[PDB]
Amino acid sequence: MSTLYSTQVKAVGGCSGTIRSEDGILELKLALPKELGGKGDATNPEQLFAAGYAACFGNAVIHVTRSNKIRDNDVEVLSTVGIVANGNGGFALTVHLDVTLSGISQADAEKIVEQTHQVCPYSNAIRGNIQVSTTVYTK
Amino acid sequence: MSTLYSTQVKAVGGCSGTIRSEDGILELKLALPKELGGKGDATNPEQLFAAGYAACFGNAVIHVTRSNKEYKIRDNDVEVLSTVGIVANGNGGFALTVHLDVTLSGISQADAEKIVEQTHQVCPYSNAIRGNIQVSTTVYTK
């Protein structure tokens, strides 16, 4: 199948640097978090991943819902992205998702979230390398 | 065991909604891009992943190089352009495509290729997607 949408982001200046999308829309400063001895002044790869995953997973829920018989405003995702030390003195990403769906039964929410992980390109991207944990809430 | 750093982002309102880190540091509007029939006003998951990866990879180059002690590549010696696409997969869902253009300053073409190959083994984003996405990489010097 052919690519539906493609975008480019340039990163310069290292841990302290900037990201800028090639059209200029998204531009921001990066900082090492304080936990890694930086200023915590600005965003970082972990937070950008959390943001993208939270948005991607919420959109994927609506893709699932339109395939079958829930609105955009019935869906909330909280991504918790962490960094854990591996053996060889590098880092691995961890991910926990809190998914809140309004107006649906506990059973239906569990089914929708399971199917959403099969649709969501972030989930498909990281499967087997990051064990994503998910908690499903209803409201 | 320990988590060294953890961060939380809330997303509401769908592809035209918002994300907000719990510490308020990151706050931005989402839009559907023009290629998909939206205003293309604002960011989206492909652009956020391209930004996170480009940043993470360039940082891993610096971490790797910190004691390749010979050229000692600095912050301004590394540029990463990530190209991220979304495509239908076989199966009712979507996959990302990732291409990186890595440009390193002040080092030989052969040294740059070796450094990039090492940093893919150390980069948390590269390690996260291995076996699911075939990342393609083009290495440049200047």
Automatic annotation (TrEMBL), chain A:
<dbReference type="InterPro" id="IPR003718">
    <property type="entry name" value="OsmC/Ohr_fam"/>
</dbReference>
<dbReference type="InterPro" id="IPR019953">
    <property type="entry name" value="OHR"/>
</dbReference>
<dbReference type="Pfam" id="PF02566">
    <property type="entry name" value="OsmC"/>
</dbReference>
<protein>
    <submittedName>
        <fullName>Organic hydroperoxide resistance protein</fullName>
    </submittedName>
</protein>
<dbReference type="InterPro" id="IPR036102">
    <property type="entry name" value="OsmC/Ohrsf"/>
</dbReference>
<feature type="disulfide bond">
    <location>
        <begin position="56"/>
        <end position="120"/>
    </location>
</feature>
<comment type="similarity">
    <text>Belongs to the OsmC/Ohr family.</text>
</comment>
<keyword id="KW-0614">Plasmid</keyword>
<dbReference type="InterPro" id="IPR015946">
    <property type="entry name" value="KH_dom-like_a/b"/>
</dbReference>
<dbReference type="GO" id="GO:0006979">
    <property type="term" value="P:response to oxidative stress"/>
</dbReference>
